[model samples]
Target: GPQDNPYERGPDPTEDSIEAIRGPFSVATERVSSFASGFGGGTIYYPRETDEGTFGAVAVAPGFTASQGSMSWYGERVASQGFIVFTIDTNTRLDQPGQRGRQLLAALDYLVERSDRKVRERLDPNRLAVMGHSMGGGGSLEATVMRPSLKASIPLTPWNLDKTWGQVQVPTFIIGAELDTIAPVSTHAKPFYESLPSSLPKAYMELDGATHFAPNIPNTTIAKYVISWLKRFVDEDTRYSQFLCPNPTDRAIEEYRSTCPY
Candidate 1:
């Protein structure tokens, strides 16, 4: 059966293929009217049309001193690709990584509660993912370790002083920036990747000349991998499997390591 699957080897990164997966669906965003205590509310991004089936939901938090607006690009871009993305603000910009992790979970709870309403019926709470940048990225990892049921997680330039991430059981993707002083690859990203259990599917991508802010915005190269990873793992869409395997040859990436056959 594996031999019969065209996507078993992953999709090649052609220009048309990348573009095809990036857009075509219009997206809309709204601010949550209420939120749990000790956590800032969230801004939700969803597809404009309601024809599609229930979509996977992802909860994202901004980095230290960053607001939900700073990570709005991620919500917008990912929502355009057919996922429901929520970018939330921490109660305080200075919350610790572990605190932020719990806050991320609270945001997901808020999303789940709100999705039961008429307009948000398309959001599938069962199929969920988590993502963030910098401290929020580390929080994403913490959340994954705390809640192993999460379908996927993407931590971009994660900065956590703790190195006990070996317990993370969810499928994860760590994006590292080569020139980041905020969260150097040597101490943060690399170790985080190494700490993850080899039995779990994982990948580490180091951007050649990028800085800590690279993950804050929508980047074509990074978006391609992120979209596919979420689609394949969170949505369980085999069509996206083609893009996960084989990997892409991009000069923008300084290094790419993974436990393939994910």
Candidate 2:
């Protein structure tokens, strides 16, 4: 059952719940290496409830100089939506782009293994999504394009752009902040959109009055767009026009103008 306040998690969501029994809570494990050999490291968040239906997992890699904790804020939120989210740290190995993608592959492998014995088998290996911030976003885009296993990819405020946008075969969501100076929208996002292959479904959303870090922050409006896109693609809940179309909307700002787009 969904809560009236979807994002709130402080009052012990697991308590007084007869429907879903929260499973074992892994107390913030750290320093787990990436599958790409010598690259990234991070934490994994799994829902303790075993009776829930099997669903895919999402691996999130934060931007430069960020740690695993930087993304924990969304772990519970995503888990509540029926997912096993893995928050990864790629801040240390910023130079290696390919290695970052490999790390995502590693995390997916771990999730599949963990799901094998679980009662719900919630970790669906075939239905996986990968996401990232800033530099990590750039790497995630490249990696998803390269790997056939990745079903969806979301790049938040991606840094740097090349024709590599054509490399993405899976659905990719690009979110940009109007006020982001570090990675200008024109250079980082627009070109990537233009270069994306027509065969693959892609959508771009620009957040008005939003800077680089605003969306990731708590209780912000930008979080709505991010989660909406994820649920449509990663969770396979395609109720919107843009669910399968590259052009989600002809109007640039229609979806984000409302208090809640969903």
Candidate 3:
């Protein structure tokens, strides 16, 4: 299957080159146990340090038929911003709705435990958030709704599982691409945002010319907003919330309108 990497660029690699490219960090991997079943898998990426306390923590979930490699682009960008990034692979059967979320919750638990120990105290789980793409995006929303430990969630072109929007209690940012056919902008994105109880603070943004694959790391528009949104909630700032909120016609949102939601 053409490797399934939407971020593909230049020439393809040969069998010999593939083996040479593989390495320890090249195949960065981690594991944590979920409440149900055995361990779940993930990949971690760290950022370059700066004056800020620490970037924070982010758990990424991949959409259906996608793997951790497909999300490396966005994950790397989040890592560049000083946050510890963990991208999850939800490859179980379709019948297992709880499997993905349970796996994600296990990763969150691992981060919490890691933050307490002196040897691995680099992460700040309290300032944690979750982001997912396509099916994974929808999964992230449902996961956060079920697991309240997540401070914020961003679901990019999410899937609608019917009647689940109202159940979301945590702050959520739903992103949509105007050209997305799988999860249409007006249908899933808009309705999901509107369906959420007025009591909960939720925001939905539709990227005008983008597609379902735009949220991956290689895309500039998705990368910028992903970082900005995470910084807003995980870092406890409201500067970027305007773009993510409904009826976002303010100057802050207008600034991103041309390149973002259409």
Candidate 4:
């Protein structure tokens, strides 16, 4: 029963479940235009069922000079697992990390206040999250500081000039591409993970033999953990925690680090 966690949407997860291309729910998509005062609009993906209650939402942003389409696969992929996902474009292709952060927040506001009934009614306004690639990933970190109420944040091979993130309180999961030259893990992902308070729920995973552009496409290892992180934090669904803890040891992962018991 939902008494366990009124927000738990899917059936109990399995080792095989999170790796599947889709989840239990059917997904529906609505395209939003760049009609916002702060951010450019893209598309909103949500579960098609009314039987389940409202779901947490996440706003996904692309890296510097990248379009929303770079993250297009996430919409239905994540939404089918029972969360609202918006993959958006920045106002400008070269918007800095801070601008990307502000835009990420703006997109979340649009989800709650500006979206039509079909979207507005399905949102669990209090349980929102943010995700991004490269600079946008840096913005995900920025959004957590600006608005600490976020349930989760997943930054893919995040690139940022700022490394001190001791202020972030949200559960953050950062994916690093092991061979990334653009935002080398030494200066970007690892340092960002280290700067974060150990007391906060956080984890850093480096994809083996991957490049800076790995997150731009569909990969099972990326999908599995991304889904697990969002579920463990956003939905407060502990069933998925099995995949997170004891840290992933698959062949595709170069290294896995986390502050477990989160």
Candidate 5:
């Protein structure tokens, strides 16, 4: 009863802590295959120590015409922070947003049902999330609506034919690239953010002068916010709220949008 937050798992939050490339956890990986479950395949990254207890999990998808390689960075980046992360491949290179959404769900299922003893033992089946880039980013939205039980959702410069997301209840964080032509913040990220129910907890961040491929690489702004969002919602850690509520104005950030005190 003394713990500030029962779900809190790592060290106290700090500007530097959230900005670091790696978190406090030592991470290890397991490979899944193409013939695997419903999705193509992926690498599962988990914290090596179970001292903190079962961890929430997330499934990440790459953009259209991309593979798991594009999302490889986030697997370790987020997992090391405290999670069981699955960076997956879709059934095909051209799979649509809806298809990628399905693959993301199945990928999470595989993590829970088929992961080896280590991963399964560490996974908290009830706490899960989804993320992706481009079309895969759209899938992240699709996955959230499909699985309302999810704890959080992050869609980066997502490309999708659909714009409205009033039905999405999961706490969502959308990242946009200011210079992105492919999924312009104007038509894609901005609309999507505006479309979310006005009453829902959500935030949108635009990377300064960044492009469509900005999320594909390792970016501190992206990592910190991603980790912050996951920890805040999935772990119910209010410690991260400080970083979000102030409306981060880092030089690398183009803009920030959200209903405060979330």
Candidate 6:
């Protein structure tokens, strides 16, 4: 049955899918106070049980003029799916992508060195990913470009003036909102997608009738893809492979394109 319908693979698009977000491991969260660099504060969400094995870690940053709290929903959702997720606030809300990128990396380092014994024991420093919304999304791209070792990155409606992304080697998933006026797809997401080297695994999804802030909160549509991408690349888990391929035929998905192998 799964081999016949690509969308049938993994979780289906329904309230049930969103309600049962947590993976095999239970979820927990903690506030991070100490950091190697300047940051307003940080929140780390992680799985309660590690008997299954160490989980990949992901650091998330908010959009320009946004706080870490705005991105917490994403962190919690991803963490519930068995990964360590850290959502951090930049030292300043107006920080540029380069500054935000450095802060994102610092946040990841802080997450790995967390004082919580369980978090520290379960976090895998080697398996890592980065995510963000708008400017923070651009920073996610910048971080991946700077640190080629990162497993994956997801930039949601990213905004950046610089269009040079030819050197980025890490796998990237770009999420764009079709109706977003701020950081419109034409100037931001589209160029970023086009600039990325084809050799690097990449995917681009445009949410029909969505706006710039559409991705700021949790939505079933967004969660399905984000979790699938993370599981597919960051964890190298094949369970999510089916969800990543053949694309969604739903009308809500305006567009879906990827170079990743099925």
| Top TM-score prediction, candidate number | 4
lDDT of 1 by residue, 1-262 (tens): 2354322222333455454534545777777753555478878888766664667788888899988887887776777777888888898889878888898888887778744363268677788889998999999999997899999999989989997688899999999999999999999999999999999889999999899999876687788888878877886666666666766568888998888876
TM per candidate: 0.90, 0.73, 0.72, 0.98, 0.98, 0.90
Distance (Å) between predicted and true CA of 133, model 5? 0.5
Best prediction by lDDT: 4
Clashing pairs in 6: none
The digit string of per-residue lDDT tens for model 2 on 80-121 reads 545667788663745444556666666666666532355225
Report every candidate's CA lDDT. Answer: 0.81, 0.59, 0.60, 0.93, 0.92, 0.81
In candidate 2, position 89 carries an lDDT of 69
Per-prediction backbone clash count: 3, 2, 4, 0, 0, 0
Model 6: per-residue Cα lDDT over 1-262, one tens digit each:
3354322223333334434555545678888763446555688888887555678888898999999878878766777777889888888899999888888888876766744787889877888899999999999999997788999999999999988899999989999999999999989998999999988788899999999999876777788788878877887766666677767555778988888674
Residue 58 C-alpha lDDT in model 6:
88
For candidate 6, the per-residue lDDT at 229 reads 84
RMSD of each: 3.6, 7.5, 11.0, 0.8, 1.1, 4.3
> Once superposed on the true structure, which residue ranges of model 4 sit more than 4 Å away at CA?
none
For model 4, what is the error of residue 98's alpha carbon versus the real structure, in angstroms, after optimal superposition? 0.5
RMSD in Å for candidate 6, one decimal?
A: 4.3
Q: What does candidate 3's lDDT look like per residue over 146-256, in tens digits?
A: 787677788888875653578777677788877888888677777777777677766676776777887764654455556656755676544444444434442223122
For model 2, the stretches where C-alpha displacement exceeds 4 angstroms are: 1-39, 91-93, 114-120, 161-163, 239-262
Residue 197 lDDT, candidate 5, scale 0-100: 85
- For model 5, give the 10-residue run with minimal summed lDDT: 1-10
Clashing pairs in 2: 23-48, 23-49
